[PDB]
Amino acid sequence: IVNRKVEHVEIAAFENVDGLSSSTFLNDVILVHQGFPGISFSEINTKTKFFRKEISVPVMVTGMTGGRNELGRINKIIAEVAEKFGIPMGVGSQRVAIEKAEARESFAIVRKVAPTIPIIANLGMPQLVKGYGLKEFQDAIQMIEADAIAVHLNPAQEVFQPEGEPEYQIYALEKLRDISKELSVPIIVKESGNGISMETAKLLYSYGIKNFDTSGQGGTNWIAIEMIRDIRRGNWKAESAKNFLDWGVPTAASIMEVRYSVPDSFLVGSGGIRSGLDAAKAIALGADIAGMALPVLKSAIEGKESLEQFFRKIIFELKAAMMLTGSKDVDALKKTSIVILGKLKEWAEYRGINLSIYEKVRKR
Amino acid sequence: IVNRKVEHVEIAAFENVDGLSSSTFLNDVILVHQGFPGISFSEINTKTKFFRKEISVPVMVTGMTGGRNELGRINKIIAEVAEKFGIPMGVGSQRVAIEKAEARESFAIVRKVAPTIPIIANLGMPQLVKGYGLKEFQDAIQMIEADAIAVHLNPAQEVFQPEGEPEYQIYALEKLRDISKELSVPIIVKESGNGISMETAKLLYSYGIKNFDTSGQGGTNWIAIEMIRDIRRGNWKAESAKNFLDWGVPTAASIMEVRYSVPDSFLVGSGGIRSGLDAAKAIALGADIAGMALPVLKSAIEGKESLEQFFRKIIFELKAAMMLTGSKDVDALKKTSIVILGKLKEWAEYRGINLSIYEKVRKR
Amino acid sequence: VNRKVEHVEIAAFENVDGLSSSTFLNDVILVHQGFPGISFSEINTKTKFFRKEISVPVMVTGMTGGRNELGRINKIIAEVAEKFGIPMGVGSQRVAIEKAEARESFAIVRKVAPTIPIIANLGMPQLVKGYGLKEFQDAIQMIEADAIAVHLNPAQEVFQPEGEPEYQIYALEKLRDISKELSVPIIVKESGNGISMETAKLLYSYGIKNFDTSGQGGTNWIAIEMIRDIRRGNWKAESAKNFLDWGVPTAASIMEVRYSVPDSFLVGSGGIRSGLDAAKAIALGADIAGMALPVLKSAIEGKESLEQFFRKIIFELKAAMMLTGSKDVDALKKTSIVILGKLKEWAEYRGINLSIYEKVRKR
Amino acid sequence: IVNRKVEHVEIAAFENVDGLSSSTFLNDVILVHQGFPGISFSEINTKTKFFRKEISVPVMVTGMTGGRNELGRINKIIAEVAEKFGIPMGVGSQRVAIEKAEARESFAIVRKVAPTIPIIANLGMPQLVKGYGLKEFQDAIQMIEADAIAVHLNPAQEVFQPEGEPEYQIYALEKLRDISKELSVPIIVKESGNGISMETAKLLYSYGIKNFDTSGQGGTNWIAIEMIRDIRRGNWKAESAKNFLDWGVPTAASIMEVRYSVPDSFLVGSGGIRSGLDAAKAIALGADIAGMALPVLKSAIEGKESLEQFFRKIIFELKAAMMLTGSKDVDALKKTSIVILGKLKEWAEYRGINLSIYEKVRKR
Ligand SMILES: C/C=C(\CCOP(=O)(O)OP(=O)(O)O)C[C@@]12Nc3cc(C)c(C)cc3N(C[C@H](O)[C@H](O)[C@H](O)COP(=O)(O)O)C1=NC(=O)NC2=O
Ligand SMILES: C/C=C(\CCOP(=O)(O)OP(=O)(O)O)C[C@@]12Nc3cc(C)c(C)cc3N(C[C@H](O)[C@H](O)[C@H](O)COP(=O)(O)O)C1=NC(=O)NC2=O
Ligand SMILES: C/C=C(\CCOP(=O)(O)OP(=O)(O)O)C[C@@]12Nc3cc(C)c(C)cc3N(C[C@H](O)[C@H](O)[C@H](O)COP(=O)(O)O)C1=NC(=O)NC2=O
Ligand SMILES: C/C=C(\CCOP(=O)(O)OP(=O)(O)O)C[C@@]12Nc3cc(C)c(C)cc3N(C[C@H](O)[C@H](O)[C@H](O)COP(=O)(O)O)C1=NC(=O)NC2=O
Ligand SMILES: [Mg+2]
Ligand SMILES: [Mg+2]
Ligand SMILES: [Mg+2]
Fold first, then answer.
1. What is the CATH number of the domain that holds B304?
2. Residue of the nearest CA to atom 5 in ligand 4?
């Protein structure tokens, strides 16, 4: 399992798996340019709420890694930069540290170095059907003094991953619902590159889930990562993974689906957010914050100052989109004028997303 | 006419005629990803009914060959693997064996080696206007102890094939309707690479036909095969065949057309089914089972263990698609959520396929 | 005289067929019928062309004439058309109204094709330049024509180095008067840029009932004149280039004319290159399919080349009828189609109600 | 400073910034061909009104340059040819000449050499928030005896330009409105490559602005120009500019939006007008006149006779479109039949541009 954590980072960082045969549908979203913005750049306010805390920018780093010391040093760099910028940070799956106690430090370092920002713990849905419960959740949370815990959905990844098994019985949701009653922090349910649909969002909501992270297709392709792991071990599933490279809900469509089917959700729009303009689009479309993982990893590996430059660039690009839409603050961005075209439009139409009611929901 | 059988197999197996200038429209069908499936992979049930028998997977091998001993050995390999996997198998046109009695064994071997699975006999619609009747149908059936007989439509192929004629007078259907009253097994009407429209489906239904096999364009291109036979004999029809390479109803559209216009039909979706994902899409769209021919031929030529690996891959991919849509069984897959986009959408719209009533009919 | 030779040479040997243009015929699909309900041998391709019967619903539209080498091309086309029972238009006869030595290069057509419909040809601009009844009667008598086509070519005239585009309404007043005295009917045809519903309705309001779409996507006359311009260092060349995709695509023109004048007799032409294109043109609303350029190219190759060409067109037409369950031309006109993509958006923007369209193209 | 002025001309003239990663959407507009025009070429009348003057062609040169003598000599060439053709001419931003008095001659030369055509002064909207007022406007106007003054919107350019700031407080519009009461000539508000939306047009109209110049995306890409200036000085904003290369309202969409949202506006359609056919399309879509800048610059640099040939070509192409549309004059062109397809069609639909009421407004 420890080797898999390193192999994941190495394939994501150095192989060709970002947007491989997949699409966010964000090219189908246009933010309407305002030649008279009505504001000045210096007055743009990017602050927003993240549960009980305030954050500096409506962007987060979503969970990636942890489990060995070299992974901990990646976590350390991301956490210290995130703290500097006032940006929330999720950690990778903490399964490895619930088991092997030597793996705990590679997660705990995050809170040592980032005492103020929201920190989000991480466990997988399949562990709920395998005997994780309240205590494991509390241990994941306490380990980093987390402000929330993300529970990940990754059935696509599990199906193609060489080492077993995709298990998603409804009992897991009953358990999740029970756990949420005893926990002192909120639960976020996030996908892992394949996106959340309205049926999935409504099912989760019916069990008390109110916080969602789209992780749609078009960014890091987890089916591709497992495909590569399969190719590497001469596992025949590789050719089957290849047929599923474009499987999933595109990020842009997932954001629309979650916002429309659960209008009061707190929503992270993620999966292929690569610029402050993507982030601006995600928010205008209906997300409360934009999430990123892969490009943060790649910069962090390059080093601290590379990662600081990366965030400087994201933030500037976000502010430029706010400036050029006349959005003085995040709230104004959420209601700014957009155009939806092409395949995203056809997707919304077939799925019964009445654009008229969509407009009202995304902006009230 | 025996060596036409050989030439067909050789061109299909070794020339470039799969999907040549043609399209299934299956790229316009998306199965909606469910990040919380509600099931586990191991509980997925792929069993379904095929007339009076149960089959293990909702997939069949459609009719191809027979007529000489080398063709019989291909039939033998396919039949033994299909028996092993619990998959129905059609044989190729049995005309050759109604005439030449030496050709009978190359069909009969199928039932010797596959005693339990449904086996489907095969005769051509033109033979009905050329003097075939009850006795020839009963002989075709008895020869392999068939559980059904497929009657093929191939006017496109006949038009471009160097040797003779396209004959499809309505008298053939009168005869077919009479024969169906005396036969102890059901009749399936199948196309052969060019697809079944609603006009054709309704006409066949008005003569008592209830079982259809779409064989749409986008897979094996029979116009291309005959084009190649023409090029080879310096026949001028070759250039004309080239103008018709994209002629026919795409598989996806044919499935919609048959299901919509004959809502209670038993429906095989075929013509360019190349993965278990294609098979999942065909079923979700409205078929009861997915049919395949060419890729089974190519693998069978490679050998028994190649064909076994092929089916293992198809079945895995089908189950992956079911897993990732939350479909515990074939019935759930038939009603799972989809998106229809692009040209298939415009096709449906022009043809008056009301998507609202469409969604209703396919989900039953 | 020399323009006439240059036109044939550029059309035949330069790259001007469908150059930056489109028929929109790729947006039309004929619905395949796996049970046709007919046999190939019973397919009947006969149809009416005014007072005559023709063997196939296809015509050769007007191209050339004016010198003896052009007459020998006309002769080859006419003799093959006669053999196949196919109507033939000749090129503009202006040259032969003027120069009397040019008459034989047109007259040869009737000598060699005594039974098929033969269609005379004069340009609409000539009506504002003094041509009238007598010139029309001369063009007709010269080949014992069964009809006369009057061509519209303002686009060609705008970019052609030598002079002017003149289309005052007076021309139509004159045309209407002429039609009262003439013993054969008038067809109005374009020349590569298509007939719109505004143009069709205007012509209909002056008594014109016979149209030939000659839409964009086939022979590109703006391109031909662009080439003549490039050759003489004329600056208009670069401007012609900007207009290479100007005009109504053939498929859209057929829809527009059939829709806006439901009882018209309609030739669908401009980029018809196969019997499948011909089948589509007819299913879409034309009564017959016209061709020019590919007949020219084959004729230049020779008699037997042109015979093989027609054999191919006819087989391809019959294949589409077979595969559509169309026993005759009338059944083809009502066969099931799908319209997609840009043609669909064109019709929508133009207010072509598809529901009423279907009714009109069928009845 | 003043060499930013020369650097702009140099990059625009000699680098690849025309339509870079951007689009006018003019390919989605088709003028319907009329095979019987009902006119002759020689009777086509291209005259139209430009405020209190008559002009020979419905085309103008929009503002570009001025500030140094070499820039003045470009202005001189453009002005003398515009005078010869009866075409209105805008000058570039006159800020430089309000400040440095040595820069005045490079603007004044325009009126010396073009005594009769409309000449349009130019000042930036940002200068209104930076203390420019009535006197600066009157000085800009008097310096060239202007018949109007254009106030330019360029927040996109300012955001990416290395030297300083985007400031667009509503106070500027209050000031602009006050200034317009004291001015003896009308105000045009123009963009600068990124286009005017309906929200921006309605806001300006609410402050008394009735004259608009779209300057949509698809022509000169000002974000690209500044990107290049950034690349040249190793400024990190370069990579961010690259993410915004396709930002803005396309010219064709901007024409539709301004005509639709302010039906009585006097409207210049500009941003990527490169031929008389583009000019014809812009007018048929709803503009009163077509504007051009970059191609006029490029020809002017080549010299007087190159620029004369350029206009000869534009005018011929415009008349060809009028001829082939049966438009005897500019008024008939404004109501000629068109087709709108593709992305422009989807843009208008999403933005609630009812095509039925649209046709009425552009024709009346
Ligand atoms: C499915 C992924 C997993 C589950 C672990 O599998 P198992 O080994 O079965 O876990 P175990 O059995 O419990 O040990 C790993 C994950 N770590 C992970 C590694 C790296 C390197 C990349 C790039 C991304 C993620 N993300 C997805 C990101 O958070 C984003 O949502 C996504 O990448 C889209 O954003 P984009 O990258 O900006 O386009 C993860 N998400 C998680 O929820 N948990 C994690 O641990
Ligand atoms: C028209 C085709 C014929 C009729 C025989 O012609 P005639 O010689 O006139 O018969 P006669 O006069 O009676 O002697 C041959 C056929 N054999 C045949 C051979 C090979 C090698 C392949 C690949 C395809 C088929 N299929 C089509 C397949 O079953 C599928 O429908 C199709 O391939 C789409 O699925 P994909 O392959 O997955 O894309 C046949 N269909 C049949 O109904 N009968 C047959 O005998
Ligand atoms: C505008 C064209 C003219 C007018 C002559 O110009 P002027 O010199 O002004 O004549 P004058 O001043 O009066 O002496 C020439 C034309 N001859 C002609 C030459 C060649 C070689 C080809 C290929 C095409 C045509 N066609 C168009 C064809 O009939 C078809 O409509 C068209 O080609 C689309 O079908 P596709 O080729 O199958 O794609 C003609 N159309 C005519 O009506 N008259 C003719 O004389
Ligand atoms: C925003 C533009 C500016 C601001 C100056 O920057 P600052 O230094 O901030 O100004 P300061 O601080 O006040 O000194 C420069 C501009 N000059 C200018 C230079 C050249 C060389 C080109 C090609 C074009 C423009 N245009 C836009 C053109 O008129 C067209 O609208 C546009 O090009 C689309 O039409 P297409 O070229 O046909 O595609 C100008 N527009 C203006 O309103 N003012 C000008 O000074
Ligand atoms: Mg896991
Ligand atoms: Mg046969
Ligand atoms: Mg002429």
1. 3.20.20.70
2. D93
